[PDB]
Amino acid sequence: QVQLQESGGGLVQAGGSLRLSCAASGSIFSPNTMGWFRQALGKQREMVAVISSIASTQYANFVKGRFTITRDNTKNTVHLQMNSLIPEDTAVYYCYAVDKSQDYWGQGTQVTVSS
Amino acid sequence: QIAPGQTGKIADYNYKLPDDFTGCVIAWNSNNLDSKVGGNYNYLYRLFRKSNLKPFERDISTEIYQAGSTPCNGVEGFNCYFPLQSYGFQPTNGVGYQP
Numbered sequence: 001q002v003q004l005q006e007s008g009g010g011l012v013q014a015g016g017s018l019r020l021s022c023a024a025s026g027s028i029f030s031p032n033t034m035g036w037f038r039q040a041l042g043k044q045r046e047m048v049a050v051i052s053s054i055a056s057t058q059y060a061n062f063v064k065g066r067f068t069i070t071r072d073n074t075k076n077t078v079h080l081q082m083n084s085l086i087p088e089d090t091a092v093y094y095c096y097a098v099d100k101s102q103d104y105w106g107q108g109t110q111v112t113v114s115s
Numbered sequence: 116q117i118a119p120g121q122t123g124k125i126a127d128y129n130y131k132l133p134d135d136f137t138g139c140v141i142a143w144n145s146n147n148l149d150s151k152v153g154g155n156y157n158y159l160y161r162l163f164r165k166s167n168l169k170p171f172e173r174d175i176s177t178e179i180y181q182a183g184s185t186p187c188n189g190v191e192g193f194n195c196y197f198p199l200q201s202y203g204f205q206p207t208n209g210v211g212y213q214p
Contacts, residue, residue: 033177044153047197052177056189058197098175103157 002026002104004095009109012085020080020109022095033098034078036069038062040091048093051078063089085113117142128161133170149204149214156201158214163196 008020022034031053038046050058051069059067068081078095090113094106116123119136126132149155163180176198179187183194191197204214 031175033175044156047201050177052175054176054178056178058177058179058189058191061191098177100175 002028002097002102004097004104004106006095006106006109009093009111011112014085014087014113014115016085016113018082018085018111020082020093021077022106023075023077024097027099027101028076028097029100031100032076034069035096035098036080037094037096038091039094043091045094046091049080082111087114089113124162127167128164131168131170131172145214146206150206150208151204152206155204158202158204159199160202161198162200163198
């Protein structure tokens with residue numbers, strides 16, 4: 001049972017900062033890919049960002065230069081730094097392990113930004 | 116496109132079958148299993164690669180492809196695109212676009 005733990009969201013005023021985290025346990029063979037995806041009530045999964053085993057970082061044009069992914073090799077975990085927030089970012093996020101086999105999604109982190 | 120000796124975005128950029136295959140390709144309509152009302156975009160497809168594959172090669176690299184002359188450095192923009200688009204599997208799609 002591959003399980004990924006999500007944490008670090010909540011209510012933040014406009015301009016604030018947060019640090020989400022997905023920690024992966026289970027099989028997760030070495031060539032894995034950790035991604036993060038957006039969903040606001042009324043829309044589908046919007047791809048936010050991706051890091052592969054190469055450590056390359058990939059981000060969509062929606063949030064250019066605002067969010068970052070940090071990779072921890074020792075625990076093979078991922079931390080998404082959410083900075084310079086704007087109420088267009090009000091959407092629950094889920095993280096996605098591409099891996100090599102059956103894919104596993106998240107339980108969700110509520111991210112809310114408004115004034 | 117899943118048969119030996121063929122070309123196409125799947126036969127060239129997803130999964131190459133050598134001209135000397137011994138084996139069977141079998142598929143069934145997954146309209147009532149894989150499609151959702153709002154569209155199932157959990158199945159990803161590449162349109163761009165630097166080169167064609169070798170048979171039974173699997174590339175899960177997500178590196179942004181350089182359509183232009185300038186390097187992308189893993190960042191999209193002008194002539195820089197992600198490898199994977201999403202497929203709009205919906206239960207109202209035509210047979211060609213059904214899963």
